[PDB]
């Protein structure tokens, strides 16, 4: 039912979150919660990138909007008022993603979906070390799918079958 207006044309300015946002929007049909969190990581290496630029200032503008329009959409809500449990939900989700991976290793069957998710859970980590707060295992969780999303690939890529 939410939706938000759309977005102008998207620069190769913005091309390094352009991965992160557009995962947002599709999350907008399966939560926004996490959508919410998602659009709040891009601003901020959005503003980092380029500040305030007479030409990206639109897509600044109306990507802030559509996190208020968020936050006005679903009005009293614990994720949103309450951090921490948007902080549980989102570390929730990576350990799904995680285990969805372990769980197709064990089947002794690779695919892209693996590779995939492992970049997803990477990207959930980011979302939250804004927080300014990183826990153990999610520094390692990033450095385990980093190297098994490499490892995989490369494996692949070489015609190996991956372990």
């Given at each position: ?45 959005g503003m980092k990138i380029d ?113």
């Open positions: 039912m939410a939706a938000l207006a759309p977005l102008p044309p998207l620069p190769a300015q913005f091309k390094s979150i352009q991965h992160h946002l557009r995962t947002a929007q599709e999350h907008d049909k399966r939560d926004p919660v996490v959508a919410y969190y998602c659009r709040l990581y891009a601003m901020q290496t500040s305030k630029t007479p030409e990206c200032r639109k897509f600044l503008s109306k990507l802030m909007d559509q996190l208020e329009a968020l936050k006005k959409q679903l009005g009293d809500n614990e994720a949103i008022t309450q951090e921490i449990v948007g902080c549980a939900h989102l570390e929730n989700y990576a350990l799904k993603m995680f285990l969805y991976a372990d769980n197709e290793d064990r089947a002794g069957r690779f695919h892209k979906n693996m590779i995939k998710s492992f970049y997803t859970a990477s990207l959930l980590i980011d979302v939250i070390t804004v927080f300014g707060e990183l826990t153990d295992e999610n520094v390692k969780h990033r450095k385990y799918a980093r190297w098994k999303a490499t490892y995989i690939h490369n494996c692949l890529k070489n015609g190996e079958t991956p372990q």
